[PDB]
Structures are given as structure tokens and as C-alpha cells.
């Protein structure tokens, strides 16, 4: 599957590469998420001669909005009140929408699929580290505090 790329991907190369990947990896993951184009010679004309620097522009208007959701989101005073019991003992778990309701309200309007959790349930009341993956290149170090009721 000779396929052209529209962003840098993990173990095959960067933008403007014509990599032979397996058919399942091209059809199911890369192409629907806009990360590839099935490399017709009419598409090499559409990309490699014409849009070598124009599709390289579009990858750089996205990184400006990628570094901006890091610099203003350094506050780390995230207060979420949940019902609980005593010395831990959580009633209702904190998911990824729950973290994406306060940082949505205090920060950037971000979707729920951008929260990275090592726990995922977040039962024990208190502070917990919450990494972000708003895009697959730029990360953040934010800690969310769980508050009882």
C-alpha cells in the first residue's frame, strides 16, 4: 500500500513520505483521520509538486493552537466537588468528562477524549496527576484536585 502522509507518524516517517504500510493500517486508521492520502500519481501531482509547502503550512497553523493550550493552562487550581464518604470512600467516580468540565470551564473548551489517566476511576479523594494529549506532539503536566461533599 503505497500511501502518502500528511503529518509525522510514529515509526514510518514525517510529512511528505510515501511509505509502504499494510492495508489495514492505511484504510482503518490513517486515511479516515486525515493522516494520509492513497498515493495516486494524480495525488502525487496534487501533493508532492503542488502542495509540498501548502500542506506543510496547514501542519504549522495547527501547532500555533497546540502551544497555546499549554501556556495559558498553567493554573492547576482545578476544584471538582463530588459526593464521597470518609477518608477516601468515593460515591461517584471521576472520569474524563469530569476532568473536561472544569478545565473546559476554566481554560480552553476542550473535548473529553483529550484527558490521559493512569487510574481512570480516580477513587481516592485528593490531588491526582492528569496528563493531556490535546494533540499527539505536545503534552502538559496538570494535577486535578478531588474535593468531597
Amino acid at each position: 500500500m503505497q500511501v502518502i502522509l500528511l503529518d509525522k507518524v510514529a515509526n514510518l516517517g514525517s510529512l511528505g513520505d510515501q511509505v509502504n504500510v499494510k492495508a489495514g493500517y492505511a484504510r482503518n486508521f490513517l486515511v479516515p483521520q486525515g493522516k494520509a492520502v492513497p498515493a495516486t500519481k494524480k495525488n502525487i501531482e496534487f501533493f508532492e509538486a503542488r502542495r509540498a509547502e501548502l500542506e506543510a503550512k496547514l501542519a504549522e497553523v495547527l501547532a500555533a493552537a497546540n502551544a497555546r493550550a499549554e501556556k495559558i493552562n498553567a493554573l492547576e487550581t482545578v476544584t471538582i466537588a463530588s459526593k464521597a464518604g470518609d477518608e477516601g470512600k468515593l460515591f461517584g467516580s471521576i472520569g474524563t468528562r469530569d476532568i473536561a468540565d472544569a478545565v473546559t470551564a476554566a481554560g480552553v473548551e476542550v473535548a473529553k477524549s483529550e484527558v490521559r489517566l493512569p487510574n481512570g476511576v480516580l477513587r481516592t479523594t485528593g490531588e491526582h496527576e492528569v496528563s493531556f494529549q490535546v494533540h499527539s506532539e505536545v503534552f502538559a503536566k496538570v494535577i486535578v484536585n478531588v474535593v468531597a461533599e
Binding site: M1, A23, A26, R27, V31, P32, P38, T40
Partner: protein
């Protein structure tokens, strides 16, 4: 029914010719699979009931081509 919508593959019949050449009628069923295909020209998925040969055709002609062939053929999708 077991019809690939891309290639029109259809269950033909044959025989189970054994070692003593006895013939019992069997059916060669196609390798159909329901599959969703990302249509960038509509920004959605289309669920085609397509054989595994027919997915090779979509990866060669492009998905935006075969969906025009099915309109000109007269089958919904």
C-alpha cells in the same frame, strides 16, 4: 442476500468431488463482510456489504469512484 455490492459476487454451486469422485452439490459462498468505509467527499462512513475481493477494488479505484458506480447501477448504500 450474499451479494458483494462492489463486484457482484454471488454464491455459485459446485460439487464435493471426493477421492472416489462422488458428487454432492455444494455452494461456494463468497467472502462477504459488512464494512464501513470513510468517505472524505461526504465526511462520513458508508456501510457496504462487500466481499474481500471488493475491498481490494475500493483500495485501487478509490471509494469515491465505486459509490458513483452504484448510483449508476441503481443500488442504495
Amino acid at each position: 442476500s450474499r451479494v458483494c455490492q462492489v463486484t457482484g459476487k454471488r454464491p455459485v454451486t459446485g460439487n464435493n468431488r471426493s477421492h472416489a469422485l462422488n458428487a454432492t452439490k455444494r455452494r461456494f459462498l463468497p467472502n462477504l463482510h459488512s464494512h464501513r468505509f470513510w468517505v472524505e467527499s461526504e465526511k462520513r462512513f458508508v456501510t457496504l456489504r462487500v466481499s474481500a475481493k471488493g475491498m481490494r477494488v475500493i483500495d485501487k479505484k478509490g471509494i469515491d469512484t465505486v459509490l458513483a458506480e452504484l448510483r449508476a447501477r441503481g443500488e442504495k448504500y
